Symmetry: D2
Subunit: 295 residues, 4 copies
């Protein structure tokens, strides 16, 4: 037997960084959770108890905290590129650094209508994430994503004309609730290294905001033929509004709201056009996935 | 042996209600999770397999869905009063109905700056809750609450002058991070019945909003002497801005952000006034509780 | 306004203790999560920023770790009595200590059929808990519990003869699945202080084991007339097999497994006596509660 | 733009199956959660609102319930092969079926030492899983796994001799706690189709049990040089005890138990060889991964 593949590192490193402006007196906070896994010439650590090759996970932990000290933590695409680059450059035998970041929202608190200088709220559990892969020779791969964007529309969704057979029981419909948790991942064209990432920084924060805008706009206005149809439209536009994206990937669960028929009770009319009260379903859920690139 | 106390019912009933305005074309959605437990003359169901006394939990489930059909679901204080009242009036042997509601945020989506008529986002995991207890003879007790309000301030919190002894190691401080998840519960003066609840309805939605405003304002501006000091101030004001509240209760966990000392590394200065990067702590957490009434 | 009630302390203190036998070479591990909240003359900490009265939560954290060092951590009833007593005796102004412990299972690993001396598995997420309340003057109140005992029986449960009305749709049944997560809490007669707890120690571990045995035996063999009927029987016996219990409390959710009718598909027969495949329901759930004492 | 990749289906389908032996009177229960995603010629459903190509997720839900009715649900490798095969054979335009199953433990209850015929306990949250990929032309790929196996050893783990530099602070050690949640995935050599799966069935249940045995045995007895070293040894043996495995993959988080130094308190000695009481750490965690094949 032999080691086909190996990576190791530190997961779930919670990190908080405060930037204190002395002019304005205005503080800004950033909170991340960071994962770093390294690959390279480390298989002897697995086969020959050879720890000489192991950069301790604790040191990787340390290094995250240092790198966040010595460098900006935002935008995460950059921070992850920095942190990843660090480990391949620092260590001869480490040939890949895989950095995952989840950004937790700390939104400035409005007080009577005045951005408070040092108070924030977690205004949503919506996450911004990156997956940065820094590989010796092959530059830097970046996947940016938003996840946990939970939305619903009460009408202006349909689903009709789907295969019917001895396994079908679902009734065609022209009016229904559509609700989903949006997972939207855009993959950047490979960068040569840290310099090229540094040059594209403004596009990171800017493209994230666009993915969100588009997801929400499209979800809202599209008289959805299906989840399939509506997710494709979102992906179309993110590609079209930013050239450096090679691929957009949506994963959308269909959180079903069933009709409750209460006609058995004093002929009470709650289905079809008289549908008011629905039983939101926890499980099961449709899951719909799409990857979209350039033709 | 004997039954000292007994309640039963249906938990985790997810409920969704849509209100379709035909003038404006504008839809509004409400989503709840509801629990109902009944008490009364039911001990034989426990001791003598006497199911004659059991209003099936399934029927209670049905009844929730019906009551939401036939009545407004908002504000929850009212819906819970209605749903509770129903069961004590309907059934001779049921002498108490305990209704718990959690309201899940569906905020109208802004699109280019125009309230969309039928699209919503779950803009926070912050919950509005009620606990309605409807007891034959003793009218209606209501506890309204907000929970899951996660906040943080980077400065303008202190904690000094606390007991020191052979068990103390914590260093006094004049500048620190304070972060908490706010649990704020206000208890209404007993109502006589459903009529009196119905007459106080405008105060429900209005008092909730005030509890939130006050929690956020006070948390922000107060140069906190302690969590104790700051939570008391919040409770003070909620009492003072609404007469029908008998008691305000805060429960606040202290989510600690530890300083990371990186001086061992190239003399890097990250503590005291040079604190930038902190390790948010998952556990343990201070937990601080206060109930405040009228003197 | 005024402080009606106040408690504070440290929550979620994870604690691990190893006992190294030097004769046998055999190690034993205990892992807890501990919460301590104190009451007493502390209201000035809330009203007058008077921190002099606050035993820092950090020190309480320290004290837990010390007390576990200097004392046995098992059984939890005792550890909690010790830890609680400590704080009322040590501090003049602290008049109550509330200690909550959750014990996490570390079961010795069997290897070829030989208790390994230092390897363990978390063989279930079933928790043993205590709630110890140590109050100056009023001795020590103890509530012991088991929670998270997830069980199911495929048959030998029924539910018929329950109220039917214009809110009922549930069909009587003589054969069904019953599945629940067992919450069983037994309350000890008040102890005078730490000495009396110390004298009743053997009964703690011994009564816990009995509550479990009884819960499982009774759940299994009882042709349940209802959840009500079956939980009462369990409580009956725990009371009857240990004299120092004043009250037994069960909370049992009814995790429903619905029949799936597949007759619409090639006349496939899956209901009634031909029921094989069921859809386990996540929500809603019946919730059934009973407190049982001595008549 | 164009659809690079697409799959859709039903997730989180909870499924329960009872087998009633009429001879013995002995019932046996199986509970799964199932996910099915299909690929094939479905891109028009995304681009042209062409629902004709969509096998409704609801029908896929139905099909799972039927397939479990008409076929054995155990072992999951087989059930998943059956369920996957079904969809590629049934539908001309569906070219791949991806089936994920999680098996939830229902262990027969021992009562006085007699396997009860119809009562079971969820004796662990340890999961058995499969990932079955059924692709038109390319037969059936199966990944079997165990996850959520939470273990700990108090001693007989070490970690010394690892790279040290200006980022290192971790102290070498010869005695420490090692604790992890085991994720062990074994990948089967490709099968031609359902017949070949059917012929290898006895090996499925049998290889799972071996992966568990080996994981536990090796974890226990190995004086671990590192997590790396110990996971490799486990993988080695699973490969060596079953020929049809092509690759074994372990993912092991290192759940750290920190030493608490209590010397500041009455010179209390709790570090090094006097370590008794430790603070289990929730985060961060080392994460260690290895894939092992045949050289
Ligand atoms: O948008 C949808 N896509 C689907 O594939 C589907 N299946 N059931 N409902 C559905 N809705
Ligand atoms: O309201 C429902 N809609 C559905 O699509 C469905 N499928 N099974 N039961 C159902 N109920
Ligand atoms: O606000 C606080 N109150 C307390 O009681 C405490 N203890 N440690 N830190 C603290 N902060
Ligand atoms: O930064 C810290 N602050 C604290 O209050 C504390 N208590 N133990 N370790 C600690 N670290
Ligand atoms: O045991 C039960 N008790 C109940 O009260 C009930 N209601 N529906 N099913 C039930 N089962
Ligand atoms: O199988 C079912 N059993 C029930 O008790 C029930 N109640 N609503 N739908 C149901 N389905
Ligand atoms: O087994 C280990 N492997 C590692 O790579 C490591 N790093 N810190 N501790 C560790 N333990
Ligand atoms: O006890 C500890 N062990 C460690 O490996 C470590 N790393 N930071 N703090 C620590 N404490
Ligand atoms: Na390198
Ligand atoms: Na009544
Ligand atoms: Na005292
Ligand atoms: Na096909």
């Amino acid at each position: 037997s032999a080691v086909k593949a190996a990576r190791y590192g530190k997961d779930n490193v919670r990190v908080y960084k405060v930037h204190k402006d002395e002019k304005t007196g205005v503080q800004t906070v950033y909170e991340m959770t960071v994962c770093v896994l390294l690959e390279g010439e480390i298989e002897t650590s697995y086969t020959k108890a050879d720890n000489s090759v192991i950069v301790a996970t604790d040191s990787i932990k340390n290094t995250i905290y240092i790198t966040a000290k010595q460098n900006p933590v935002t935008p995460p695409e950059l921070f992850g590129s920095i942190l990843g680059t660090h480990f391949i450059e620092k260590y001869n035998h480490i040939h890949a650094a895989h950095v995952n970041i989840v950004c937790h929202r700390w939104t400035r608190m409005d007080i009577d209508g005045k951005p408070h200088p040092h108070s924030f709220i977690r205004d949503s559990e919506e996450k911004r994430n990156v997956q940065v892969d820094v590989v010796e020779g092959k530059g830097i791969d970046i996947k940016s994503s938003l996840s946990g964007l939970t939305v619903l529309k009460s009408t202006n969704s349909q689903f009709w004309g789907f295969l019917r057979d001895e396994y079908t029981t679902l009734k065609e419909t022209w009016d229904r609730i559509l609700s989903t948790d949006v997972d939207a991942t855009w993959q950047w064209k490979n960068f040569s290294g840290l310099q090229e990432v540094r040059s594209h920084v403004p596009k990171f924060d800017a493209t994230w905001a666009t993915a969100r805008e588009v997801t929400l706009k499209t979800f809202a206005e599209d008289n959805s033929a299906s989840v399939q149809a509506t997710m494709y439209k979102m992906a179309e536009q993110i590609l079209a509004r930013q050239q450096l994206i090679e691929t957009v990937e949506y994963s959308l669960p269909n959180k079903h709201y069933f009709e409750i028929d209460l006609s058995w009770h004093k002929g009470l009319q709650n289905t079809g056009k008289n549908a008011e009260v629905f039983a939101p379903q926890s499980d099961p859920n449709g899951l719909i996935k799409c990857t979209v690139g350039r033709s």
